[PDB]
Amino acid sequence: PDIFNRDPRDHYDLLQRLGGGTYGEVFKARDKVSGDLVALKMVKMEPDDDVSTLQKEILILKTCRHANIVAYHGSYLWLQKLWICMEFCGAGSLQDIYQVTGSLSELQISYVCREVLQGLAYLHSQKKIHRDIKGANILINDAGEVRLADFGISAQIGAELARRLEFIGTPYWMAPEVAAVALKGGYNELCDIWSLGITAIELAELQPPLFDVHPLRVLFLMTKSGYQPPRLKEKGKWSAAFHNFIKVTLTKSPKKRPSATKMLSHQLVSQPGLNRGLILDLLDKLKNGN
Template identity: 30%
Template sequence: DCVQLNQYKLKKEIGKGSYGVVKLAYNEDSEQYYAMKVVSKKRLMKQCGFLRRLPPQGSNTVFPLEKVYKEIAILKKLDHPNVVKLVEVLDDPDEDGLHMAFDLMKRGQVMEVPTDEPFTEEQARFYFRDIVLGIEYLHYHKIIHRDIKPSNLLLGDDGHVKIADFGVSNEFEGTDALLSSTAGTPAFMAPEMMSEHGRRFSGKALDIWAMGVTLYCFVFGRCPFYDTCILSLHNKIKNKSVEFPETPLISKELKELIKRMLDKNPETRINIPEIKILVKSMLRKRSFSNPFECLGRRAERSMSAPGGLLTKISKEGSREELEDLYEDDSYTESKE
């Protein structure tokens, strides 16, 4: 029951979305499996109403397919251990299906929310470090993700998290994106997105807020703000202080980190460099480097990655600063 698409054999369905499906794909050339996202262009246009009517001339309406092609353009630029890798795009103008081959993440999303089995603080710290590295890389390359949440964080074979789904992401120029549109998942949206119409807000701060909600989910198994009514949810996000359950117990340092990420004021909300300092302090100066990455690959990545990974080696070959980055402790899941 396989469908042949160039060198790929499309097998069973492993996921589903609004405009298409994700299929297991076998590449006969490389003899490896991939996740093939298949987007129906007709269904995408129809669900957005574009087959029935065209937008008025001069409007700022973005065609649905343009959003998909924008996502592809962003993904093609990215190469980082904590960001999902787009391998290939197959798009025949005469065919309905737009095919995107991604590295296969067999272990799926890092966590389903809500859950009665949240992570230990050690597990949460390990996965959160991956998110920090991934977001730092995206912001350095002038990309705001806009939809960070556990279901968009996939586990690789090495046990590390990779950021996925760039469907609502934004590129920017300068030091930060100034946004005014609403996008993302309601329970992970920052309070400034719910302010008066037309107000512009920092893109980087939106990602930080969503990271804070995600970290809260990691240790408590649920979102800090939740309501079945969207208006009540918005009200809680804007006005209610974050509360911490009595159990499980978490450290004061982790509480402080979550509080600073969930600061209602984007102007005073903690930023990525400050998060790294706080977490490094929590970990007694343990590194943010990837423990599964060889030294050569790390040195190569240091030329294109931000923050602590932007390390120059002196002519004398001094590696004092690099050695500090390489110190690490990797989290090993217990086998039951």
């Protein structure tokens, strides 16, 4: 896959850290030669991470042509630190945008959901799971394309699972079923479908349900037997299709939750009038206001 064995700072200059920690170590950078702006993500490499596996995963990312996946431009290995070069989105995430433009329109939310579903179906078709669908992780590039970042690499999943070990504690005494559950963490492809439903509410109300309750209490609320899937709080403001999209995506039982493929036949994401223009208006509103 031709992963560079060079210090990426040999070719780029870091300008700005992105995400405030929510993205990890991700930087806005400038191609020294061409001056092009890119995003460099640094995935710390453990000695255990087999570079043979890395090469296979990077090849998959390099050959990706899906319009809803963040563009891969190359990668670097230097001092056991893997760097991935991708497109830089001046607009950033949808969270960066609606924090300025405000509530997104139903059609705009519909376009976003359709595009994210298309991307989710591509990831799921590779037996990948995103696990963190949310406004902060859906990116709008300068051309108005909705894209998800594909970080399906063992070194990244290993880092996430490294925090999961600090969460569950020491494993030496754990039963196999406890270790298996803790490892998977309940994450399954259809969990991205639920997360998208929540995101649609986030884009519609500028925050997810129960955001006014501190996390610990929400975890106990979510896991009550009678926990009910959230809904939009302003009925009249939205069509029956939007409400139904939420109802269907936010199915409590994973077995009965529809896949990304099936969801693409839903009225809200199949309706006429969904075109890139909707995002170009949003970008205009962000750059120039009212």
